[PDB]
Amino acid sequence: MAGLPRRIIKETQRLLAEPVPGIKAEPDESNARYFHVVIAGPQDSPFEGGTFKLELFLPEEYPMAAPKVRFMTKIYHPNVDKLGRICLDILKDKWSPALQIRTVLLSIQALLSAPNPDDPLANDVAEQWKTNEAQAIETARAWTRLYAMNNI
Amino acid sequence: NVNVKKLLESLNSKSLGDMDKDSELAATLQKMINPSGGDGNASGCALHACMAMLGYGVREAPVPNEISEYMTGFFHRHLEQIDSEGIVSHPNETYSKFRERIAENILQNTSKGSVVMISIEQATHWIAGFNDGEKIMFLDVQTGKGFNLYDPVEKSPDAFVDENSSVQVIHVSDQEFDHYANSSSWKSKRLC
């Protein structure tokens, strides 16, 4: 009930007013800790033209607890599993109270423009991406048309 | 390799203003402490500005996935000096009127050529403060600007400060500075 006030207020006000280019967001009516974020699939990326939904949850001790983010929209990505779980380091081990939400949001949007190989977790998509890149793209492009478009 | 306060005069006495020579130096250092940057490594970039103004030298600042190396501890520690409501802009107060008013919990509680970590909106953002003796120099070095309140574009001298804008100045021990120069995180950062 006693935390780091100014920062959460200011970080939120920024997310719903002064947000990162290509990222908009609307807070959840029920819980004020959950944010309904929307990221636009970048250009020259397989997701171009798609608007993906992400769930942003700010835990109890947010600054001292990495925030929780996940794709609520399906997507063929070597770094996002079937459940929507993103595989970003600054969300896992490498998270610090010194990093803000923008850091994570930016990181994710960067990941769409250019997926990451250096990924220890086992994933079929990943496998197809690094070998059959050609087809893998074709497929992401089609999933962006199915799940990431007309999805609102 | 114009390292150390060598060009500390090359970017100080000219036809440039006070709030003007800031964005000056920072823009230089930025090119060394944050080769093309703009993410969340603010905290790291600022700790490095103090590092250069304290003499230790300029080293590429830590990037997002390296912040936890040391920064998570610095926070660990100085947290009470951050969860403070610190200085707060008054209604209608301008950017210069606030930068000057802030250069007090500095100029006063200062030293010969000492530095400080300035927290913006309680860890929302960071900038480094340097006391040259008579005035103060605020350096962002992450986006290479002078004093600002996490603004994409450096704001005009007489723009209005948003309501309730707050900055907590962080007094940083010289030991803390020596502790970081003796840390692996620091020694592993690319020099210059």
The residues spanned by each domain of chain B are: 1-192
Q: Which of B104, B93, B87, B101 is nearest to B166 (CA)?
A: B87
Nearest CA in chain B to A99: B40
Contact A98 B83 (CB under 8 A): no
A87 catalytic residue (yes or no): yes
Token pair of A132 as six digits:
């059959």
Contact A97 B123 (CB under 8 A): yes
Token pair of B17 as six digits:
């203003």
User: Domains (ranges, CATH) in chain A?
Assistant: 1-152 (3.10.110.10)
Among the four given CATH numbers 3.90.70.140, 3.40.50.80, 3.10.129.10, 3.40.1350.10, the one describing domain B1-192? 3.90.70.140
Question: What technique was this entry resolved by?
Answer: X-ray
Catalytic residue chosen out of the listed positions A39, A56, A75, A87: A87
**Residues for chain B: how many in total?**
192
| Cα–Cα distance measured from residue B3 to residue A121, given in angstroms and rounded to the nearest whole number | 43
Q: Which residues of A98-124 are buried (b: 16+ CB within 10 A; e: fewer)?
A: bbbbbbbbbbbbebbeebeeeeeeebe
| Cα–Cα distance measured from residue A94 to residue A152, given in angstroms and rounded to the nearest whole number | 34
| Cα–Cα distance measured from residue B12 to residue B27, given in angstroms and rounded to the nearest whole number | 13
Nearest CA in chain B to A19: B152
Contacts of A10 in chain B (CB under 8 A): 121-122, 124
Contact B122 A6 (CB under 8 A): yes
Alpha carbon distances (Å) from B38 to A25, B31, B60, B111, B133: 21, 12, 13, 31, 30
Q: Is A122 on the interface with B (CB under 8 A)?
A: no
- Asked if residue B35 lies in contact with residue B48, where contact means CB atoms within 8 angstroms, the answer is no
Which of B36, B48, B65, B87 is the best mutation test for A, with the most CBs of A within 10 A? B65
State the virtual CA torsion across B35, B41, B42, B43 in degrees, nearest 10: -130
Token pair of B19 as six digits:
């709030």
DSSP-assigned states of every residue in chain B = --TGGGGGSTTTSSS--HHHHHHHHHHHHHHHHSSS--SSTHHHHHHHHHHHHTTS--BPPPPGGGGGGTHHHHHHHHGGGTSS--EEPPTT-BHHHHHHHHSHHHHTT--TT-EEEEEETTTTEEEEEEE-SSSEEEE--SS--SS-SS-SSPPPTTPBPPTT-EEEEE---HHHHHHHHTSHHHHTSPB-
Q: Is B72 on the interface with A (CB under 8 A)?
A: yes
Closest by Cβ to A6, choosing from B40, B68, B166: B166
Contact A107 B72 (CB under 8 A): no
* Cross-strand partners of A53: A38
| Cα–Cα distance measured from residue A12 to residue A40, given in angstroms and rounded to the nearest whole number | 19
- Interface A-B, measured as beta-carbon pairs within 8 A, has a size of 72
Q: Which of A66, A97, A65, A90 is nearest to B70 (CA)?
A: A97
* Cross-strand partners of A51: A40
DSSP classification of residue A85: B
| Cα–Cα distance measured from residue B66 to residue B82, given in angstroms and rounded to the nearest whole number | 21
Neighbours of B151 (CB within 10 A): 15
**Burial class (CB within 10 angstroms; exposed 0-12, middle 13-18, buried 19+) of B31:** middle
